[PDB]
Amino acid sequence: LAIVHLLFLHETGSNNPTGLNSDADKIPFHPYYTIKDILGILIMFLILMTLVLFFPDMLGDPDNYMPANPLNTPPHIKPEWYFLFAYAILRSIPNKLGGVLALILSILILALMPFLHTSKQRSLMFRPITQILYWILVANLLILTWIGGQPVEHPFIIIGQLASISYFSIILILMPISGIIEDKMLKLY
Amino acid sequence: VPETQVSILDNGLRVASEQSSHATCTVGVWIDAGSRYETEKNNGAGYFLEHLAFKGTKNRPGNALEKEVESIGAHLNAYSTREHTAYLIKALSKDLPKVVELLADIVQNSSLEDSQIEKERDVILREMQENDASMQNVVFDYLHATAFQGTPLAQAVEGPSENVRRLSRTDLTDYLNRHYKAPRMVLAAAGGVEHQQLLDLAQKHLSSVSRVPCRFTGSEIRHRDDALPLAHVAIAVEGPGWANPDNVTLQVANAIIGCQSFQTFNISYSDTGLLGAHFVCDAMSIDDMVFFLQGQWMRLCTSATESEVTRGKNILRNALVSHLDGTTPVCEDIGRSLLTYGRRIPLAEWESRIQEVDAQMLRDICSKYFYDQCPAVAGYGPIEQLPDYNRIRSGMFWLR
Numbered sequence: 001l002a003i004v005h006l007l008f009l010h011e012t013g014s015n016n017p018t019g020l021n022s023d024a025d026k027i028p029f030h031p032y033y034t035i036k037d038i039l040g041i042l043i044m045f046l047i048l049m050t051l052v053l054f055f056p057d058m059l060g061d062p063d064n065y066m067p068a069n070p071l072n073t074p075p076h077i078k079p080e081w082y083f084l085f086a087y088a089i090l091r092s093i094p095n096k097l098g099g100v101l102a103l104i105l106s107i108l109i110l111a112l113m114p115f116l117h118t119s120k121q122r123s124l125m126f127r128p129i130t131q132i133l134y135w136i137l138v139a140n141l142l143i144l145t146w147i148g149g150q151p152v153e154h155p156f157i158i159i160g161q162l163a164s165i166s167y168f169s170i171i172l173i174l175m176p177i178s179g180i181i182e183d184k185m186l187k188l189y
Numbered sequence: 190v191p192e193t194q195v196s197i198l199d200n201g202l203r204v205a206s207e208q209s210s211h212a213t214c215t216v217g218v219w220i221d222a223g224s225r226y227e228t229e230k231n232n233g234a235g236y237f238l239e240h241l242a243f244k245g246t247k248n249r250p251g252n253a254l255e256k257e258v259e260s261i262g263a264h265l266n267a268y269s270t271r272e273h274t275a276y277l278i279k280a281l282s283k284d285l286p287k288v289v290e291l292l293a294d295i296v297q298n299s300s301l302e303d304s305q306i307e308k309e310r311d312v313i314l315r316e317m318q319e320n321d322a323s324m325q326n327v328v329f330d331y332l333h334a335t336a337f338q339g340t341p342l343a344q345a346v347e348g349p350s351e352n353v354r355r356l357s358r359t360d361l362t363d364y365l366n367r368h369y370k371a372p373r374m375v376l377a378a379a380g381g382v383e384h385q386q387l388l389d390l391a392q393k394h395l396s397s398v399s400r401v402p403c404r405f406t407g408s409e410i411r412h413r414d415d416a417l418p419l420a421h422v423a424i425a426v427e428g429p430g431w432a433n434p435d436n437v438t439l440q441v442a443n444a445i446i447g448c449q450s451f452q453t454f455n456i457s458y459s460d461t462g463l464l465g466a467h468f469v470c471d472a473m474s475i476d477d478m479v480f481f482l483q484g485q486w487m488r489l490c491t492s493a494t495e496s497e498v499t500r501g502k503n504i505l506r507n508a509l510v511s512h513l514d515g516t517t518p519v520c521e522d523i524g525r526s527l528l529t530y531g532r533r534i535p536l537a538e539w540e541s542r543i544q545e546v547d548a549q550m551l552r553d554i555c556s557k558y559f560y561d562q563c564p565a566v567a568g569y570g571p572i573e574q575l576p577d578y579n580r581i582r583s584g585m586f587w588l589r
């Protein structure tokens with residue numbers, strides 16, 4: 001699927017942070033960007049080996065070092081960190097089914113993302129209001145990651161419920177309206 | 190082959206001649222003065238003086254100069270490079286008496302009528318407005334700009350339109366009075382001339398002429414204009430020089446190399462130069478050619494063959510200029526030899542320096558000048574597929 005991912009991209013070429021047509025300024029990759037990917041590989045290996053050789057259990061759970069007991073359930077069950085944002089959403093919706101669906105949508109909302117683009121500019125380099133909304137989205141994604149960790153009790157629950165409401169409202173509603181407003185400010189709309 | 194006999198006069202002007210049985214003669218004056226001696230405030234002084242030099246001197250006001258040199262039946266000629274300026278006349282030998290007096294006026298006693306100055310300015314300017322049509326010259330005047338950035342060797346012979354418009358008699362007078370010294374001048378004659386008669390004529394006329402860190406930068410200039418049908422690309426490294434002995438082993442290397450219009454050049458200036466290749470190709474193939482070129486340079490550097498060297502020595506052998514080539518070609522060689530080497534190198538010495546070249550010293554000298562060197566690249570036209578500097582620099586060497 002990653003090979004298919006690379007193919008569906010070369011047909012169009014990569015994007016640039018300005019969001020403009022970069023056909024006037026393109027350079028080779030092997031001599032030019034490879035030393036950049038090699039440097040990024042080296043930095044990622046530095047972070048991976050300082051995660052392995054120095055703090056090998058800062059991201060895992062201690063209760064996984066006990067054998068599986070069906071008769072006892074660890075009181076505090078938390079899915080791993082990167083599933084937390086989803087975990088929060090699931091816990092937030094009162095209805096079980098609702099939670100499952102919202103959870104799925106949490107990931108799927110992204111797929112839905114290319115149909116929500118209502119701006120005449122591709123990138124957010126020249127779009128400050130949608131930049132603010134994007135960083136608020138990153139902020140409450142971090143909040144949902146924290147909440148998942150917290151146990152079920154006040155006021156963690158309410159934050160979770162709001163944070164999920166704010167997440168879906170920023171992705172679904174606030175960004176296209178903000179893009180319309182930004183197009184209106186540049187005398188385009 | 191008859192020897193070239195050189196004498197020296199009071200002024201310091203040299204009088205070189207190489208008698209031959211051909212009937213006409215090519216008498217010229219060379220001067221060690223070009224765009225390299227200009228200091229960016231008079232960047233077109235030599236070119237504009239080269240335009241003004243045939244428009245009349247005190248002795249020959251108006252069209253007199255052209256008229257007489259026309260009447261005698263002499264095709265006068267002139268040219269300017271980055272280091273040398275030449276004024277030469279091809280004429281029936283018997284006319285030396287006037288072929289020499291006329292040349293004397295052209296170098297001294299010249300008159301730069303301001304009226305004429307105005308017109309020549311327009312001429313130069315307008316032509317320059319169109320000199321852009323000579324793509325090859327453009328490519329070669331940037332292969333110079335980007336290779337000799339910050340030096341007087343980057344600036345063109347014609348100069349920028351700016352200076353052309355902003356030039357005055359006095360400035361010209363200066364360039365004339367500064368870079369036209371007698372010790373930096375050679376009176377060269379080729380063909381049916383006697384050396385003693387030419388020496389007496391130089392003593393009679395022209396005996397009045399007054400007696401008084403270039404660097405290569407591996408770089409790249411890319412002029413992209415996609416509307417042009419063809420692309421011209423020149424890649425060069427630092428040539429040894431004019432006097433450097435290895436020049437000859439480099440000429441043989443060029444004779445080994447010989448997409449499209451893939452010429453090869455060894456341009457030499459005073460202890461510097463540009464050694465490389467210029468090729469014009471459809472945009473889509475620029476990449477291929479650039480690579481092919483490299484592979485070839487590399488072939489010589491590590492894999493020469495006596496056979497091919499021979500092919501190269503022989504072609505070089507048939508390039509040497511001689512009485513057969515004619516008077517002008519020879520004069521021209523006499524003037525450049527006295528200006529650059531200080532002497533006329535005979536063809537026997539050239540043949541000795543050619544026959545001492547073998548394959549081992551050719552690949553040694555080619556590895557000295559081509560292998561792992563930073564080139565200067567100049568492209569003009571649809572040059573998007575022309576590779577950038579890392580790919581060319583990596584093609585300047587082989588892993589194996």
Ligand code: HEM
Binds near residue numbers: 002014015016110
């Ligand atoms: C399996 C994990 C993934 C891998 C290994 C992967 C790998 C890559 C690679 C190698 C590229 C080309 C290099 C680059 O653009 O930086 C790329 C581009 C891209 N990927 Fe992914 N990707 C993954 C997941 C995703 C996901 C989940 C998304 C959607 C959110 C995504 C969207 C994109 C986009 C849009 C580009 C083009 C970026 C651009 O040029 O603007 N990828 N991916």
